[PDB]
């Protein structure tokens, strides 16, 4: 695990790539048991399910949440700049779920 020695000094010149620096090859290794630092985007995926089941379409709005069958592809990474005011966020100051 020498690549860890590079994450230990924190050299800025190392923030220009991961272990090797491949476009499609490292991607396959981004979320697999392949070398690399394993620290690349952690996204959850499921086997190709028949989309006739529900639909979700997370691409924008999930509509009904009760669905969320196996179709879903989301990435987890630090928080971005995040727009100010976040008006694109529905209100929910109440702790209890409205119903
Ligand atoms: Zn990598
Ligand atoms: Zn969903």
Hey, where are the domains in the chain?
1-40, 42-76
Please name which ligand lies nearest the alpha carbon of 64.
Answer: 2
| 43 Cα–ligand 1 center, Å | 14
Q: Which two tokens stand for residue 5?
A: 């020695």
| 99 Cα–ligand 2 center, Å | 20
Contact 56, 69 (CB under 8 A): yes
Technique of determination: NMR
Please name which ligand lies nearest the alpha carbon of 21.
Answer: 1
Residue burial 7-38, b: 16+ Cβ < 10 Å; e: rest:
eeeeeeeeeeebbeeeeeebeebbbeeeebee
DSSP 16: G
Helix segments in the chain, DSSP class H: 3-9, 24-30
Residue burial 51-74, b: 16+ Cβ < 10 Å; e: rest:
eeebebeeeeeeeeeeeeeebeee
Residue 87 CB coordination number (10 Å): 7
Residues 93, 42: Cα–Cα separation, whole Å: 30
| 16 Cα–ligand 1 center, Å | 11
| 3 Cα–ligand 1 center, Å | 11
Residues in a beta bridge with 43: 75
């Amino acid at each position: 695990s020498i690549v860890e020695k590079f994450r230990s000094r924190g050299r800025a010149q190392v923030q220009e790539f991961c272990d090797y620096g491949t476009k499609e090859e490292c991607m396959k290794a981004s979320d697999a048991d392949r070398p690399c630092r394993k620290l690349h985007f952690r996204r959850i995926i499921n086997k190709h399910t028949d989309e006739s089941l529900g639909d979700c379409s997370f691409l924008n709005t999930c509509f009904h949440m009760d669905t969320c069958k196996y179709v879903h592809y989301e990435i987890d990474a630090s928080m971005d700049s995040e727009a100010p005011g976040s008006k694109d966020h529905t209100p929910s100051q109440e702790l209890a779920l409205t119903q």
